[PDB]
Design a protein around this ligand. Structure first.
Ligand code: NA
Ligand code: NA
Ligand code: NA
Ligand code: NA
Ligand code: NA
Lengths: 217, 222
């Protein structure tokens, strides 16, 4: 009965990790047994910054080896760094790593990906290939800024083409200088047909936790 | 002109240097004595020096004012935000039918090439129920895709190409706009896009002018 969510962004640097920490915080506060994986990571803090962020959200209940399989140091590709260092980001190895968690006593398993939907894992594979092999739903994090509507709709359409369920989308309103935030969110909802699951801003709010909790119910 | 070739120019994101590429395409035509026109039917972002939008001014300057602002643009907004949002706030309807008529009305002119510069990405909205793609579909013309090479460009370029392919829209070519010389692994990213998409890059444009630039850009038109 374990719920599973593969977390992707609409672009690189949409605050996806920040959202993962908020989802972890909701589970922890509700005494829900959860785990958040970061199977592929880049950019060192010994451990990568996103790996450290997730371990810190769980108050070190888990280890880096329990959540991460492969790490890169340059903030470009995991995939271009993988080719430069002569290592592979293998779909089968990542699939086995994630599916191995399915018999743990968890209510929810989150899997934070390595950027966008078609972020490559090689010059012949993308993150979609892994998500499609897993046959699990996606949680899409959209950073609200000029151009986000095009990126959010493109990502939702690609998911639809490959019959990957969209469990929900989250508006990361990480920049209060962006004008017409509410209008951009309403447009994405209208054009996509998906109501926004949660509107998260820098200003901490309990509605964030109420809305985030509903994704998990 | 019955022989007129048409190209709808779109970007992988809102600020990818689309207009700079359009000015280079105009320059190749002007130099080869090819009769061309470049439209910017929907524009946003006021010029630094006039009441007109910056992209409208760039196109007019590229043609040395052989055309008027009314010939190249139908709808303009001062704010550099999603055009449909300003349109809704200012009681302006961005209509697919009106844009289609504005563009198709140029087809009886003595032009060898018609460029139409779009207003952001493929799915940038024109309203709460339409996007740029609806106009492109209605026009039945090929697209030129401008991709700014930067981290995240692979995902955006592949998503845009796949959306074109789903709606049976011809991709005339994609251009790598290497507008930021500080970006790491530029050739590796272009190579990844070519291998995953199946489309060889039509032209690699950098901050420094090159012979390859004009040869490659000319080949898109021939
Ligand atoms: Na296991
Ligand atoms: Na493949
Ligand atoms: Na589907
Ligand atoms: Na006419
Ligand atoms: Na529609």
């Amino acid at each position: 009965a374990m719920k599973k969510f593969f977390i992707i962004g609409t672009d690189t640097e949409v605050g996806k990790t920040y959202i993962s920490t908020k989802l972890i915080e909701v589970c922890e506060h509700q005494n829900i047994k959860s785990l958040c994986l970061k199977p592929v990571a880049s950019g060192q803090s010994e451990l990568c910054e996103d790996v450290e962020s997730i371990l810190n959200a769980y108050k070190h209940k888990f280890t880096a080896a329990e959540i991460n399989l492969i790490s890169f140091n340059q903030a470009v590709a995991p995939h271009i760094i993988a080719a430069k260092t002569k290592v592979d980001i293998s779909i089968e190895n990542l699939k086995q790593f994630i599916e191995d968690k399915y018999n743990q006593d968890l209510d929810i398993l989150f899997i934070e990906g390595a950027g966008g939907l078609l972020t490559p894992y090689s010059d012949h594979t993308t993150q979609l290939d892994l998500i499609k092999a897993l046959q699990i739903p996606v949680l899409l994090v959209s950073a609200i800024k000029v151009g986000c509507i095009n990126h959010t709709l493109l990502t939702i359409n690609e998911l639809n083409r490959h019959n990957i369920k969209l469990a929900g989308w989250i508006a990361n309103c990480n920049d209060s200088n962006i004008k017409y935030i509410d209008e951009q969110i309403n447009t994405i909802e209208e054009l996509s047909g998906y109501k926004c699951s949660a509107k998260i801003s820098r200003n901490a709010d309990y509605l964030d936790f109420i809305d985030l909790s509903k994704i998990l119910i």
